[PDB]
Design an enzyme around this catalytic site. Structure first.
Site, mmCIF file in Angstrom:
data_model
loop_
_atom_site.group_PDB
_atom_site.id
_atom_site.type_symbol
_atom_site.label_atom_id
_atom_site.label_comp_id
_atom_site.label_asym_id
_atom_site.label_seq_id
_atom_site.Cartn_x
_atom_site.Cartn_y
_atom_site.Cartn_z
ATOM 1 N N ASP C 54 40.857 43.986 31.915
ATOM 2 C CA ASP C 54 42.127 44.201 31.231
ATOM 3 C C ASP C 54 42.651 45.592 31.558
ATOM 4 O O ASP C 54 42.038 46.598 31.187
ATOM 5 C CB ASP C 54 41.948 44.022 29.727
ATOM 6 C CG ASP C 54 43.242 43.672 29.021
ATOM 7 O OD1 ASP C 54 43.841 42.628 29.358
ATOM 8 O OD2 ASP C 54 43.661 44.437 28.127
ATOM 9 N N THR C 87 49.865 44.377 32.425
ATOM 10 C CA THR C 87 49.677 45.817 32.567
ATOM 11 C C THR C 87 49.191 46.177 33.964
ATOM 12 O O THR C 87 49.589 47.206 34.522
ATOM 13 C CB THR C 87 48.689 46.324 31.517
ATOM 14 O OG1 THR C 87 47.428 45.664 31.684
ATOM 15 C CG2 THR C 87 49.213 46.054 30.119
ATOM 16 N N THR C 88 48.329 45.343 34.546
ATOM 17 C CA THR C 88 47.821 45.621 35.885
ATOM 18 C C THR C 88 48.918 45.450 36.928
ATOM 19 O O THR C 88 49.100 46.308 37.798
ATOM 20 C CB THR C 88 46.632 44.711 36.194
ATOM 21 O OG1 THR C 88 45.646 44.839 35.163
ATOM 22 C CG2 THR C 88 46.009 45.077 37.529
ATOM 23 N N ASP C 388 43.925 38.041 24.473
ATOM 24 C CA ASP C 388 44.872 37.875 25.571
ATOM 25 C C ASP C 388 45.213 36.408 25.794
ATOM 26 O O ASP C 388 46.329 36.092 26.222
ATOM 27 C CB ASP C 388 44.309 38.486 26.852
ATOM 28 C CG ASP C 388 44.474 39.994 26.902
ATOM 29 O OD1 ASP C 388 45.497 40.462 27.447
ATOM 30 O OD2 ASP C 388 43.586 40.711 26.397
HETATM 31 N N1 LIG Z 1 44.610 29.807 39.612
HETATM 32 C C1 LIG Z 1 45.205 31.171 39.409
HETATM 33 N N2 LIG Z 1 45.738 31.282 40.658
HETATM 34 C C2 LIG Z 1 46.453 32.273 41.219
HETATM 35 N N3 LIG Z 1 46.796 33.395 40.585
HETATM 36 C C3 LIG Z 1 46.424 33.581 39.309
HETATM 37 C C4 LIG Z 1 45.642 32.538 38.626
HETATM 38 N N4 LIG Z 1 45.429 33.023 37.385
HETATM 39 C C5 LIG Z 1 46.015 34.242 37.281
HETATM 40 N N5 LIG Z 1 46.611 34.571 38.436
HETATM 41 C C6 LIG Z 1 47.353 35.827 38.710
HETATM 42 O O1 LIG Z 1 46.651 36.962 38.195
HETATM 43 C C7 LIG Z 1 47.595 37.961 37.805
HETATM 44 C C8 LIG Z 1 47.057 38.801 36.649
HETATM 45 O O2 LIG Z 1 46.884 38.013 35.475
HETATM 46 P P1 LIG Z 1 46.484 38.696 34.072
HETATM 47 O O3 LIG Z 1 45.082 39.246 34.171
HETATM 48 O O4 LIG Z 1 46.824 37.722 32.971
HETATM 49 O O5 LIG Z 1 47.502 39.939 33.954
HETATM 50 P P2 LIG Z 1 47.014 41.452 34.214
HETATM 51 O O6 LIG Z 1 46.162 41.367 35.456
HETATM 52 O O7 LIG Z 1 48.301 42.215 34.402
HETATM 53 O O8 LIG Z 1 46.259 41.813 32.958
HETATM 54 C C9 LIG Z 1 48.893 37.228 37.481
HETATM 55 O O9 LIG Z 1 50.006 37.897 38.081
HETATM 56 C C10 LIG Z 1 48.723 35.832 38.050
HETATM 57 O O10 LIG Z 1 49.747 35.528 39.001
#
Ligand SMILES: Nc1ncnc2c1ncn2[C@@H]1O[C@H](COP(=O)(O)OP(=O)(O)O)[C@@H](O)[C@H]1O
Ligand SMILES: Nc1ncnc2c1ncn2[C@@H]1O[C@H](COP(=O)(O)OP(=O)(O)O)[C@@H](O)[C@H]1O
Ligand SMILES: Nc1ncnc2c1ncn2[C@@H]1O[C@H](COP(=O)(O)OP(=O)(O)O)[C@@H](O)[C@H]1O
Lengths: 521, 512, 521
Positions: C54, C87-88, C388
């Protein structure tokens, strides 16, 4: 893991070194692009000074510290010998190509993939020239714009209008019968004791040494020029004898005896003078290359004969074609066959020296471009410009097609390459994008040297579009867009053709350098 | 230790110039941000010229004078402070005539003081009056601050608040037309509501809390009482505390404490009031009579705060409570309300009269949004103060600078002497204002500033300034960037007076 | 030009300092994007280890050495407070926005021109997001795709099916008839002595302190819940008295009279127990927060009551709204109107401690999700993933629109910006191009973490074009294009919406920084 006295960059740092050298060489030469560009000085160390914007002189004569940059310097020597122009812009595209390649190589892209994009964009870029090239027939006004486009980039915008009409007419004087233009037909002569704007054309040849005697004719409206290579000065005994003397007086007798070898031949010049149209309303000229005694110069001057001495081999060959008299290697076999014909032969007087002029020739198939300037470096500066202006008109006539300038082709080819997808692989799309943004350095640099914003000028000419074939370029004086055809700004076809083939080859090979090993340096 | 000679004036110039180079780009609507490294490793990304210099440490006393003069500007005018320091730094940055030409500062100061009288005259020529009766024009004028702010959603609300508020305080009958926003326009926040609920109270609001429930909750005809003395037992001339150990003496000292507090309260309630407002505190025994009388207990009200009350409801100030005559009655007052509006009590004594004072009610949804509305409204009140004090506007966007500079350059042609050179240098210093507005937008500075000066030569000087947002030239008649006259005149005097000050310094001496 | 004990960066190098910090923070967080991304450790120094992906935890809890980078960390805090996700990706776009801007700023372009392009690209990108969003109805089949997409980015692809059904069902239990939702209705508990995959739901509520007497009932299938806050332990004398004694035993005899006030109130509890269904096959439960005397506990235990003592304020809060029993602050006013009701009420015994469960309630408007794991940090990692995951299902339910994931929106918006001519200023398109290339960092990083080529993946998804709505994404297992809507990858509308609002504002403000001054540092 290494041996003593050895070093090698196994990682991609070899590219970062070569890419850094091209960027450094880019920033140097970009300031001398175009007429508004600044000049570079060439200090030889001994004190001599030479100013010039020609990239080949800034790469051939100058010395470069970086070893990698010396490779690109040799390329300009090749670019100059084939086309005669485009050496500076060749270095800018290489630096910007390598700059855009470094942007993608940092993202993990292989260099070989980028080179395949350049080869695809290059083949498409060459086809775009065939579509936009204007095959306008060569005339006076067209070549004036071409020679003006070349000469303005090497002078202070004052010798352009002066040198333009001279360089144009020099080629037209030798251009006829659809013959291949030879630059050996135009000889370049320099003269001090006058200003820079006094440069003009000479219909005939010009010689260094002239007639030096009071009894000579200041101008010969017509004459049977006799070509010869025999010295009329004190020479050695040419018969089965020698020099044997017992005192200074007996030695003087040998001079009187040895001078008879010439005195019989000096009168031979008087014989053929009286022979071939020796009556009134006629004249006679001698262009003997070798030395001539003041006696022979004093004798023949009484008969009204202009005799010259101490000429060059090349001038004698040109003199024969201008006149027609074949060179006589021995006065004993004199005849009218060794004679020629010419018009006004006068003597140009400077403050100290004087020069011979053979204007109004019949069929010389050759002319001379008389350069005048106050300083020594200014003569070499104007000479390098005329040589570049002559090759510019030569390429325009040898290759009847021309193309626009002001970066109009680069702005057009950039939009064309963007609207073109690969046919070998998808990742070559990145190399095509690097080639597109690399060509825009020319319209970018022209905005910098003119003192205008780099981004505003390019966005205006690149945004200008219409529902028709429309050209657009950078206005160096206003900074606004400009249609190059409506103003008289034209380049050559072979210059832009060789530019794309030259930049792609060198930017490719520099990217394929995987390691740099010292061979015992 | 100390400084002497030419090192002082050249040193004061580099100090004042350095302070101006910090906030050169903090001018205009496209102002640039600044990064302030805190000692704890933190950062503040403010873009306010006053806040930047306030947090920066300065060693030169010349910088302290430049900063301290800017703070004096903020108290009088909450706008144009950044222009003072830039002009003062540019007027001082011309060190060619100062030292390299070996001119005395008195020669330079005489030219700077001569130009100042000419700059003031030229600004009045290019000025333009305003119809203050029509509030529509003041909206466009006050929008200079509301623009690029969160209150743009209620932009017209902020104008009507600041416009009408200053008109009540403006006592034009005294001739000079003095205005006091600090005293007669006291602002107090009220939690609850939204930005739209913000309004102006036609009275004086006291933030006193409700100590007991036996107080008047709603009244139609209040009766307010005023007095400066405290409702407590009469002590001696000194602050000697009363120490007692005998129980029999307690009832004697206790009876004296009860009777005197009892008799004083009996006279206050004889008029049948609704609230007793005292300047000093009120003890517990004294409050027992207020809650018994079913009247509100108020205390800690300053002098000017009480002076406004007597003008609002018609009360009368008295030294002590015993001398309370029948005149001290707030007849005609609108209402008395101590309602808990947003988890906080607020005393409303509003009426249908304008007693040369008011109080602004800042309603909002949270303390963050309340403070945003607060600081944005104070500047609007000051712009109304500057326009109502002198209803004359001058063309902004660098037009007034270039317009004035052309007058000096044309007037310097008839200036025979060595003073013409620094006199013209002041004119070229005014060009820095559009120089920064053009630098921030990104457009070419030399190309536009050159054409900008040509427009003032041929066309009228009252227009053809600079657009900070677009970067191109525009007429101020077509773009409402009109700024007041009093702000520019004081901005021009403070820059010249400050530059004249630092030029008059020739020896930084230590001693007390 | 500076005062002593301070420093100032006057030239444009101050901007490069901020660009370098964002570039560095980009390279740190790019390795933990998506499910295949790596994890980062958080060593607290005291000895606590913590693993998490996260980005809010890697910026809020992790202190950052660089001053400039700590600003972006505060924004990730603000980003997490609104949407709880992205956020990432926010930091990666900020790092690439400032990266692309430096390419043009080095060419002499002002920062203010680039920021005006971001404001234009934002509005175009914001309008295109309205077209791509799918406003379908939210069903259990859809929220599972949202929960899986959110949970796979925080777990080892093993707790997906475990926490997915729990995270989805926890939300559906707390929304009906279009009611406003609140995640505080769900309690998050943690327990040891079980594997990580032992997570499950709890329809009721978990309590910390249990009953203390041997004759207690381990499970109560039905009972009336009596809420109380009275201390049933030894209290002081409630009447106006003191301690009038002559020895220790007489002092103890008065304590018996002091216990009469409490001991009689225990009889009042037993009275209402026998009155309100004290028959066979019935029960009664007391949840008094305060303490209870051991002797008084013996009275209630023999009557079959499962008593509790020393509860927390949070337990009594949820126990009231769940069971409905009103808190009685004094047993004098004891009445049956304040009584609640519940189904099964039992205490599950763990290896070390025990906790009371009140499951089988009708509509308590409050539930609990029981997490189980072997370690401490693993429970914290799962707690963050559930919060989340719940917020992701919350946003999809509240904001009924969802958008595809896997960088399909970023690839589509970037193609739209490139197909957008200038409308606010000519040079503004340079910022629009920089905004376009910045959005492509999301699919680029997904190809890196999955182990595929950064360029091949992005070029394939870009080549997908047709005469219909086509949105492809990065297949982390295959690398080829993939319609994210078909396979079941869905992101929220507020996440992508807030990214464009958060990325542009910070990338703008950092570009407008001209100087970096020390405020007494
Ligand atoms: N089967 C899956 N396939 C492809 N991309 C994914 C999948 N699950 C999540 N992602 C990608 O991972 C990225 C980060 O997701 P998340 O962890 O929820 O947000 P953050 O990384 O900003 O905390 C998203 O932009 C999303 O497009
Ligand atoms: N007045 C002008 N307006 C627009 N473009 C010009 C002008 N003068 C020169 N150029 C451009 O400058 C470029 C460089 O010219 P030149 O100096 O002859 O070659 P190089 O710079 O390669 O030695 C040409 O491509 C030409 O189009
Ligand atoms: N919308 C605008 N267009 C052009 N110029 C403006 C605009 N707004 C303000 N300015 C100019 O910016 C300068 C500074 O304005 P302001 O920020 O209000 O004062 P300060 O910079 O002292 O805080 C003024 O001199 C004004 O001419």
């Amino acid at each position: 893991t290494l041996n003593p006295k050895a070093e090698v960059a196994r990682a991609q740092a070899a590219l970062a070194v070569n890419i850094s050298a091209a960027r450094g060489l880019q920033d140097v030469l970009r300031t001398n692009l175009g007429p508004k560009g600044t000049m570079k000085m060439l200090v030889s160390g001994a004190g001599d000074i030479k100013l010039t914007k020609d990239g080949n002189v800034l790469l051939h004569e100058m010395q470069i510290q970086h070893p990698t940059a010396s490779l690109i310097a040799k390329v300009a020597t090749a670019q100059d010998d084939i086309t005669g122009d485009g050496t500076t812009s060749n270095v800018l595209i290489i630096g910007e190509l390598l700059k855009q390649a470094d942007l993608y190589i940092s993202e993990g892209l292989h260099p070989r993939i980028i080179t395949e994009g350049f080869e695809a964009a290059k083949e498409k870029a060459l086809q775009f020239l065939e579509e936009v090239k204007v095959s306008r027939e060569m005339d006076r006004e067209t070549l004036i714009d071409v020679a003006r486009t070349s000469l303005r980039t090497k002078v202070h915008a004052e010798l352009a209008d002066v040198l333009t009409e001279a360089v144009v007419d020099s080629i037209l004087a030798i251009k006829k019968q659809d013959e291949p233009i030879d630059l050996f037909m135009i000889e370049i002569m320099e003269m001090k004791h006058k200003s820079e704007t006094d440069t003009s054309l000479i219909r005939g040849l010009v010689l260094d040494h002239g007639a030096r005697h009071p009894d000579m004719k200041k101008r010969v409206e017509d004459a049977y020029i006799l070509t010869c290579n025999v010295s009329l000065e004190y020479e050695k005994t040419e018969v089965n004898s020698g020099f044997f003397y017992k005192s200074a007086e007996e030695r003087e007798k040998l001079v009187k005896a040895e001078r008879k070898f010439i005195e019989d031949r000096v009168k031979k010049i008087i014989e053929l003078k009286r022979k071939v149209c020796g009556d009134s309303d006629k004249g006679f000229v001698v262009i003997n290359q070798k030395g001539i005694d003041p006696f022979s110069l004093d004798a023949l001057s009484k008969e009204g004969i202009v005799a010259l001495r101490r000429a060059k081999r090349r001038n004698m060959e040109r003199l024969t074609l201008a006149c027609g008299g074949v060179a006589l290697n021995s006065f004993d076999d004199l005849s009218p066959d060794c004679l020629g014909h010419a018009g006004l032969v006068y003597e140009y007087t400077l403050g100290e020296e004087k020069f011979t002029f053979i204007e109004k020739c019949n069929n010389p198939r050759s002319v001379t471009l008389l350069i005048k300037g106050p300083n020594k470096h200014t003569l070499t500066q104007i000479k390098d410009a005329v040589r570049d202006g002559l090759r510019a008109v030569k390429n325009a006539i040898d290759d009847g097609c021309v193309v626009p300038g002001a970066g109009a082709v680069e702005v057009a080819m950039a939009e064309a390459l963007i609207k073109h997808k690969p046919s070998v692989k998808g990742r070559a799309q990145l190399g095509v994008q690097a080639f597109a943004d690399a060509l825009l350095i020319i319209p970018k640099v022209l905005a910098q040297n003119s003192g205008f914003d780099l981004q505003e000028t390019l966005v205006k000419i690149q945004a200008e579009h219409s529902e028709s074939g429309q050209l657009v370029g950078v206005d160096l004086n206003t900074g606004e867009p400009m249609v190059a055809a409506e103003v008289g700004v034209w380049d050559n076809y072979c210059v832009k053709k060789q530019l794309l083939h030259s930049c792609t080859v060198i930017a490719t090979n520099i990217l394929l350098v995987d390691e740099i090993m010292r061979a015992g340096m | 230790k100390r400084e002497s000679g030419r090192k002082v004036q050249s040193g004061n110039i580099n100090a004042a110039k350095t302070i101006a180079d910090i906030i050169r780009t903090c001018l205009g609507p496209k102002s640039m941000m600044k990064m302030l490294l805190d000692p704890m490793g933190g950062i503040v990304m403010t873009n306010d010229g006053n806040a930047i210099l306030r947090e920066i440490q300065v060693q030169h006393p010349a910088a302290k004078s430049m900063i301290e003069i800017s703070r004096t500007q903020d108290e009088e005018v909450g706008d144009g402070t950044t222009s003072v320091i830039i002009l003062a730094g540019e007027m001082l940055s011309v060190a060619e005539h100062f030292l390299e030409q070996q001119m005395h500062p008195t020669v330079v100061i005489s030219a700077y003081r001569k130009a100042l009288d000419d700059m003031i005259s030229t600004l009045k020529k290019i000025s333009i009056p305003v119809d203050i009766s029509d509030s529509d024009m003041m909206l466009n004028i006050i929008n200079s601050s509301i623009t690029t702010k969160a209150i743009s959603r209620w932009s017209s609300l902020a104008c009507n608040i600041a416009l009408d508020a200053v008109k009540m305080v403006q006592f034009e009958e005294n001739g000079r037309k003095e205005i006091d926003i600090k005293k007669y326009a006291r602002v107090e926040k009220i939690p609850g509501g939204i930005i739209e609920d913000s309004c102006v109270l036609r009275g004086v609001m006291i933030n006193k809390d409700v100590t007991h429930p036996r107080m008047r909750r709603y009244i139609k005809n209040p009766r307010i009482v005023l007095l400066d003395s405290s409702l407590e037992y009469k002590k001696g001339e000194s602050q000697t505390d009363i120490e007692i150990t005998r129980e029999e003496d307690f009832t004697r000292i206790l009876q004296m404490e009860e009777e005197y507090i009892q008799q004083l309260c009996e006279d206050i309630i004889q008029l049948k009031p609704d609230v007793v407002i005292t300047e000093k505190g009120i003890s517990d025994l004294a409050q027992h009579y207020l809650m018994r009388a079913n009247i509100t207990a108020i205390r800690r009200v300053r002098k000017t705060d009480n002076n406004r009350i007597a003008r609002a409801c018609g009360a009368r100030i008295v030294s002590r409570p015993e001398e309370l005559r029948e005149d001290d009655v707030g007849t005609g007052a609108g209402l008395l309300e101590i309602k808990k509006i947003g988890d906080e009590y607020f005393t409303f004594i509003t009426d249908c009269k304008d007693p040369k004072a008011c109080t602004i009610l800042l309603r909002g949804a949270s303390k963050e949004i309340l403070s945003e509305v607060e600081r944005n409204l104070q500047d609007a009140m000051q712009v109304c103060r500057n326009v109502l004090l002198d209803p004359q506007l001058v063309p902004g966007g660098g037009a007034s600078e270039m317009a004035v500079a052309h007058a000096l350059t044309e007037k310097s042609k008839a200036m025979t002497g060595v003073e013409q050179w620094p006199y013209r240098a002041v004119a070229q210093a005014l060009e820095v204002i559009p120089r920064t507005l053009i630098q921030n937008c990104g457009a070419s500075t030399i190309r536009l500033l050159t054409s900008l000066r040509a427009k003032h030569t041929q066309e009228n000087c009252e227009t053809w300034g600079v657009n900070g947002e677009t970067g191109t030239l525009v007429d101020m008649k077509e773009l409402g960037i009109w700024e007041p006259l009093a702000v520019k005149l004081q901005t021009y005097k403070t820059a010249v007076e400050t530059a004249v000050l630092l030029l008059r310094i020739d020896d930084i001496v230590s001693g007390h």
